[PDB]
């Protein structure tokens, strides 16, 4: 069995800069007598199948942009994106086909470093419709920010909340290279009706101080 190890696991470079991914095989994949390296590279975008980029280690596949190239030989291989574009955000995999069973690397996530962008923050009270069903979800939206790092704190009647919220984050936008994040506070209708002020406090480096969006229960 041949093990494929990619380095690094994640990398972040600016629009138009050089991105280099490494792949290392546990044994040589160069078939010496025919001089081919039996190695391929794939790009996988979230929700999509992989796409072949390179084969024979350095042959670019038909329809793949000029900026993609592979090189190396034996056990050491590199995929290079010479001028990273916003749409190039994806997981990249190497694959050996020198020996069966065919094996893949664990993938390298490539991300765009862009200028800092503060989140636009929105809070949404539970709907009348949901409240009738007996539950209250309060949603805090952090829209179109960069970098990924963000903290969301729920406060209810000014009291810090813990263990009753869940968050979810989008994949980096293929056009604007930003993230958006939702944080959802879930409580029962009764617990919801036990308090008057609900607040989402957002900490992000694009903001000078934590930004709070709040509402009084019932208000519209």
């Amino acid at each position: 069995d041949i093990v494929m190890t990619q380095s690094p696991d994640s990398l972040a470079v600016s629009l138009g800069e050089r991105a280099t991914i490494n792949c290392k095989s546990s044994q040589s994949v160069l078939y010496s007598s025919n001089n081919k390296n039996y190695l391929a590279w794939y790009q996988q975008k979230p929700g999509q199948p992989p796409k072949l980029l390179i084969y024979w280690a350095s042959t670019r596949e038909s329809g793949v942009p000029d900026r993609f190239s592979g090189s190396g030989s034996g056990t050491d291989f590199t995929l290079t994106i010479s001028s990273l574009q916003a749409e190039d955000v994806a997981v990249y995999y190497c694959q050996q086909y020198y020996s069966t069973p065919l094996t893949f690397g664990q993938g390298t996530k490539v991300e765009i470093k862009r200028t800092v962008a503060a989140p636009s923050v929105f809070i949404f009270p539970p709907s009348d419709e949901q409240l009738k069903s007996g539950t209250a979800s309060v949603v805090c939206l952090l829209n179109n920010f960069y970098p990924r790092e963000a903290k969301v704190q729920w406060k209810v009647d000014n009291a810090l909340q813990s263990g009753n919220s869940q968050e979810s984050v989008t994949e980096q936008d293929s056009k604007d290279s930003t993230y958006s994040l939702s944080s959802t506070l879930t409580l029962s209708k009764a617990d919801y009706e036990k308090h008057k002020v609900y607040a989402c406090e957002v900490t992000h480096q694009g903001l000078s101080s934590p930004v709070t969006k709040s509402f009084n229960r019932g208000e519209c």
């Binding site: 694959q95 636009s120 539970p126 419709e129 519209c220």
Partner: protein
Amino acid sequence: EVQLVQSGAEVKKPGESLKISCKGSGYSFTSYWIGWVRQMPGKGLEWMGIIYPGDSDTRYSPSFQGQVTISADKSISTAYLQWSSLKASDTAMYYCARYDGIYGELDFWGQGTLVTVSSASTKGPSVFPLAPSSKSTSGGTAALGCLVKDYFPEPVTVSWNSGALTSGVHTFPAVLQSSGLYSLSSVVTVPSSSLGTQTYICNVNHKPSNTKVDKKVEPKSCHHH
């Protein structure tokens, strides 16, 4: 062009049998190796096996030998992957692909078949509006959305105004709640002005429960201004 079209997502109980399919077109089906790759949730790519539809020569990974059957029907240009008895651990995305050979790259790939195996009950979502705030905004930009709560299994699809509204839309990855049910929100930012003039409807589909909901999201009018 070369196209590989896989069968739709499957939801089954453990112990049920399953055959998924992959139809190849735009090339000589009997002239190329065709095979299968597993992708576990959040994980990488595992090679499963290949078959040459010319003569049904079928090769397996040692990991997958005895666990699945790979077959092909050349008369209808279709390759198959089957389990006699499904286990919960078979839950994954499965990709068919055309291969350059036994010792080959994978040059064309199908769209994937999501296979979900669970003894848990299939449940359609409830859909709730996330109405836009009445408070004056900053740059003439309002956010609104739909909360899609309490469904199993994944996925749901969300569209806005039947596909007509695509700009500004973020449909978040689902989160698994402690109830064992998934929940997700889909939001969109729109011009503040449009709230009185433009209707916003989220179209939610949950294929596994054959649930479809169209939820209108409108501003709340609570003041004489």
